[PDB]
Structure formats: structure tokens, C-alpha cells
Write a protein that binds this ligand. Sequence first.
Ligand SMILES: [Zn+2]
Ligand SMILES: [Zn+2]
Ligand SMILES: [Zn+2]
Ligand SMILES: [Zn+2]
Ligand SMILES: [Zn+2]
Ligand SMILES: [Zn+2]
Ligand SMILES: [Zn+2]
Ligand SMILES: [Zn+2]
Lengths: 111, 112
Amino acid sequence: HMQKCPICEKVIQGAGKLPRHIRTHTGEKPYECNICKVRFTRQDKLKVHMRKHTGEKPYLCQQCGAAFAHNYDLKNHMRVHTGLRPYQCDSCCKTFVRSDHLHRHLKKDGC
Amino acid sequence: SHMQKCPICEKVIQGAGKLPRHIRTHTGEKPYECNICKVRFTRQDKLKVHMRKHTGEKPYLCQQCGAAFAHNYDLKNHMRVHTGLRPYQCDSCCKTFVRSDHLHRHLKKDGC
DNA sequence: AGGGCCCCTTCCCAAC
DNA sequence: GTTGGGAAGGGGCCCT
DNA sequence: ATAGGGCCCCTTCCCAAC
DNA sequence: TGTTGGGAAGGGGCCCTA
Ligand SMILES: [Zn+2]
Ligand SMILES: [Zn+2]
Ligand SMILES: [Zn+2]
Ligand SMILES: [Zn+2]
Ligand SMILES: [Zn+2]
Ligand SMILES: [Zn+2]
Ligand SMILES: [Zn+2]
Ligand SMILES: [Zn+2]
């Protein structure tokens, strides 16, 4: 369930997820694309890469017809139609539409 | 409880008794206050470091020249003039840096 | 218990 | 100054 | 044999000085 | 302009004491 990496000593969660993390140290990339033969450290990244060769964006917006490569990217897009800005800075009260936009504002100062 | 997940951000915090310290990063609580300048701190060890401003203590002394410094990074920087050593080196560039964060922002800033 | 698969985060940087 | 696509990496969840 | 406080180490970060 | 660097923020290991 939880284990420390023998190289970086950071805690890795999830059973069987340690070899995947160690590949970020060793750099080994077992999964290879059948077309461009670019190698990848993880299988889910290679699967996403194969869609780049076809241009497939399977997740479509119901309102504007916009296509996205990831289903969670489509949920981020729905905020354009709903106008919802769920992230807010408790010091400024300024709102954002993505979490990293709020994270960028907090690491600054003078706010 | 050498390892525990924070009840707020669900991230793993290591070390016994280290969770309330991490919780204060969420709440902003500053229970440690310098009684001279009234500046508040979230951690006791950060208060001790701040006390050196008033005591003038420079506990980091060089073993060769004997110069005293207030922070460990001052001594490490000062050791460079005794050595000439630049300790951090990229391998996809063989470019040399003086601090660790200089190498990190070089491996993540376009370029090579 | 470990493999797919997906969700989620920040970082970079460009379009706007 | 705001938005967002791509990518790296971590963790939850399902199934066999 | 153990848990918590103190203490000091390390890192990346912003961003200003050089 | 690029490079250097001071200090903040935060996480983790070691030691001492109960
Ligand atoms: Zn590691
Ligand atoms: Zn390919
Ligand atoms: Zn839409
Ligand atoms: Zn704000
Ligand atoms: Zn937390
Ligand atoms: Zn003070
Ligand atoms: Zn010296
Ligand atoms: Zn390089």
C-alpha cells in the first residue's frame, strides 16, 4: 500500500506502483510505439500518444462541439458554459477556473 | 505513527509529531512569537533561527579560516572561495552551477 | 496483489 | 493578466 | 524499546541584486 | 540582458528525554 523508494526515499502509494516510479530515475522505457517507435515509461502514456497519430479527441462538448483528448479536460471546459470559477484565494477573493491558476497566485506575494 | 496522511490534503506526512506542523500550513496558525519584534512563526525551529538576528549568533564557522556565518548556506557559499569547487553539474549540458536550484531550473527551462 | 485505466496535480509556455 | 493544451508524475479504483 | 519535541539538514520557490 | 543568491516555505532524519 505504501513504500519508500530505495533511490529517492519518497513515499510511493499504491500496490505495485514502485517499479513505475523507479523508471523515472533509471529512464528505462519498455513501451514502444508501433509507428514512430518512440518509447515511453508507462503504457497509459503510450495509449494517449497513439491518439496523436490519429488525431482522435474522443470527448466532445455537447454545447459547442469542442473535442478533447481527456474526459477531465472536457469537465474543465464546461465551466466556460456554466461560468463557474470554483477556485478562490481566501486572501484576495479572486476566482480562477483551474487549480494551477490558483496555485500560481499563492506562490507569489504582494497580494 | 511515523507515516500519516493529512486529514485536509490527504498527503503523507512522515515523522512522529510532524502532522500538527503540516496542518498549520493549511490554517495559517502561528503559535510561536518573538517577544522582541513580535513577529510570529508557524514553527519553533524557525523562531530559533530568527533569534540569531537579536543575539547576533553566527554558529556556522569555517574549519579553515574561522569565519562565522548566520546561515548554513553562507558557509557553503564561503567554502567555495576556499575550494573553487562548483558542486552541481548537468550531464546533458556539462554546464556548471553553484546552487542546486540553479540546476533544477536549467533542466526544466527549454534549451537542451 | 498487481495491470490497465483514468483522474488529478503542477509545471511550461503559448494563444489570447 | 487570463486561459488552456501538452506532459510528467502520483494515487484511486476496478477486475481477474 | 518507544513517542514526541527540539534541532538541523535538505529542497524548490520568488525575485531582487550583481 | 543572464547569472548569482538571500530568504521563505516546507518536508524529513537524528538525537535526547520521558
Ligand atoms: Zn524515487
Ligand atoms: Zn508514435
Ligand atoms: Zn463547449
Ligand atoms: Zn489573492
Ligand atoms: Zn495537508
Ligand atoms: Zn525578533
Ligand atoms: Zn574559510
Ligand atoms: Zn543542460
